[PDB]
A paper describes a structure:
[name] homologs share several highly conserved sequence motifs, and our structural studies show that they are located in the active site region, mediating the binding of the divalent metal ions and/or the RNA. We have found substantial variations in the activity profiles of the [name] homologs, and discovered that some of them possess a new 5′ triphosphonucleotide hydrolase (TPH) activity. The overall structures of CaRai1, AgRai1 and SsRai1 are similar to those of SpRai1 (16), KlDxo1 (18), and MmDXO. Each structure contains two mixed β-sheets that are surrounded by α-helices.
The AgRai1–pU(S)6–[name]+ complex was prepared by soaking AgRai1 free enzyme crystals with 10 mM pU(S)6 and 10 mM MnCl2 overnight. Clear electron density was observed for all six nucleotides of the RNA in the AgRai1–pU(S)6–[name]+ ternary complex. The structure reveals that pU(S)6 is also bound as a product to the active site of AgRai1, with its 5′ phosphate being a bridging ligand to both [name]+ ions, in contrast to our observations with MmDXO where the binding mode of pU(S)6 mimics the substrate. There is also a third [name]+ near the active site, but its position is 3.3 Å from that observed in CaRai1 and it interacts with the protein through its coordinating water molecules. The first two nucleotides of pU(S)6 make conserved interactions with AgRai1. The backbone phosphorothioate group of the third nucleotide, U4, interacts with Lys254 (motif V) but is about 5 Å away from Arg275 (motif VI). The positions of its ribose and base show clear differences to those of U4 in the MmDXO complex, probably because the side chain of Trp154 (αD) in AgRai1 clashes with the position of U4 in the MmDXO complex. While the five bases of pU5 in the MmDXO complex maintain base stacking, the last two bases of pU(S)6 in the AgRai1 complex are flipped relative to the first four bases, and the last base is positioned against the side chain of Asn253 (αF), at the opening of the active site pocket. We also observed a sulfate or phosphate ion (modeled as sulfate) in the active site region of this structure, bound through interactions with the dipole of helix αB (backbone amides of Arg106 and Gly107), the side chain guanidinium group of Arg106 (motif I), and the side chain ammonium ion of Lys198 (β9). Three residues were found to be located near pU(S)6 that are present almost exclusively in AgRai1: Lys110 (αB, interacting with the base of U5), Trp154 (αD, near U4) and Tyr159 (αD, near U2 base).
Residue numbers in the entry: 2 to 299, 302 to 371
The structure:
Amino acid sequence: VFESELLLQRRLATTALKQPKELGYYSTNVGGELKVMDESNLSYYYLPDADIEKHIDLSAGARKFQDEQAEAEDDTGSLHGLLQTLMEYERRKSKKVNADIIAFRGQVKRLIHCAFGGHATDVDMYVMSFDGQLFIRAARKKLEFPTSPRESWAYLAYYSGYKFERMALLDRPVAETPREVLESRGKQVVRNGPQYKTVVRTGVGEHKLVLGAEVDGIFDFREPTGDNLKHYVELKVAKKVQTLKDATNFEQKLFSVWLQCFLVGINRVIIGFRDEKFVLKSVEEFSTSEIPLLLKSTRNACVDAIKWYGALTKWLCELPRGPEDDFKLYRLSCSRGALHLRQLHDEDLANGDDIIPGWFREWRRSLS
RNA sequence: UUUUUU
Ligand SMILES: [Mn+2]
Ligand SMILES: [Mn+2]
Ligand SMILES: [Mn+2]
């Protein structure tokens, strides 16, 4: 329990970020399908002006949407896919990855965000120490799906995100896509089961992290034998700005998508702007490194976030990580303006697969 | 994917 708490206004004076580097990738689907070092679920961006001129309705198909994530019974916070891909990478070099924290981008994002307007309740994770490193996972085994009717704002907003993915992405590059396919994206059923994730090594301050992140597609082209961070794009839906209150909202979405992308080196953002009827009006591309300067013309928010990020990283890295500390377990939360760490005594969580599975523990021993 | 007063 030693450094049990970290105040949300704490800041490290160091803005130093590492160049993030792609280590690996993997494709998943509900029903436990995992494919290590496989890019099957990586999509390609294609949304021509001609398509946008057709007045794309991002609420279309909401009633017949197959919510495969909602229907699945699977552990959405699990590190299993990440660790498997990591194992395979370490197996190439026959050597543990050099890093302090192993986690999902989404969870780190939530950690940073809770100092800048993000909900404190979104931070609810486990930290387990093992082999000199910290393993961090969402505590929740399943996400919180909107349960209101499908004609509701809350449901349409939720769906539109996936609908815009279907209208703006392709399974393969344009050249390799049948015409029937290019011209009928409006008809096709929207899915959320299939995912593609990158696994990246990055850093802030003195500390290095390994982050899994879900990736929306390739913007321009893929390098089969190179690092594809620079080619990835993050897709996002936002309400068309026409009022002072819209603008402030959009500034938040910008800061937020900047959190989402800078963490793992994704430099391309595309935002589909909708009206209140969920009709797509236009699309605008942004470069991630540009967002902080854009926000400056509205704030020092990005620089502070980085200082916060370094503070919480060094704070978490103060947890004991020596040979006697294997399988210690902690709950990480946010409340009353601070982050909290609390050691746990739950032998079933610590000895089961929920955080670090046996096959991975066994793999790391085989290395010492 | 949705929300986040920041
Ligand atoms: Mn996808
Ligand atoms: Mn995504
Ligand atoms: Mn997206």
